[PDB]
Amino acid sequence: RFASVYAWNRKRISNCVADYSVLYNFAPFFAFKCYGVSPTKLNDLCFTN
Amino acid sequence: LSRLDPPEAEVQIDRLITGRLQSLQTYVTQQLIRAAEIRASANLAATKM
């Protein structure tokens, strides 16, 4: 189930290893337009959360 | 380099090269005038000697 636009729910993800090459298989999207960082090399940057 | 893919990283780093070249050129431009003033002063000092 998904929440409405006015009651968007925020989820916190931390303390784990993230691989961004497995998120394509979970949804049939093709655009994945991204703003601040290239999706090609998201796997070589350490975030905070 | 580590956050953007080549086809836009080349554009991003191009905006720094021009600015740094323009900043570097003014230094030698002003040094070329200070050198002329110092040369005139040195000629005056030699004549006075």
From Swiss-Prot, chain A:
Superkingdom of the source species: Viruses
Effect of R1K: In strain: Mu/B.1.621
Outcome of swapping L23I: In strain: Omicron/XBB.1.5, Omicron/EG.5.1
The protein's assembly and partners: Binds to host ACE2. RBD also interacts with the N-linked glycan on 'Asn-90' of ACE2. Cleavage of S generates a polybasic C-terminal sequence on S1 that binds to host Neuropilin-1 (NRP1) and Neuropilin-2 (NRP2) receptors. Interacts with host integrin alpha-5/beta-1 (ITGA5:ITGB1) and with ACE2 in complex with integrin alpha-5/beta-1 (ITGA5:ITGB1). May interact via cytoplasmic c-terminus with M protein. May interact (via N-terminus) with host bilirubin and biliverdin, thereby preventing antibody binding to the SARS-CoV-2 spike NTD via an allosteric mechanism.
Annotated function: Attaches the virion to the cell membrane by interacting with host receptor, initiating the infection. The major receptor is host ACE2. When S2/S2' has been cleaved, binding to the receptor triggers direct fusion at the cell membrane. When S2/S2' has not been cleaved, binding to the receptor results in internalization of the virus by endocytosis using host TFRC and GRM2 and leading to fusion of the virion membrane with the host endosomal membrane. Alternatively, may use NRP1/NRP2 and integrin as entry receptors.
Protein's name in the database: Spike protein S1
Residues of the full protein shown: 346 to 394 of 1273
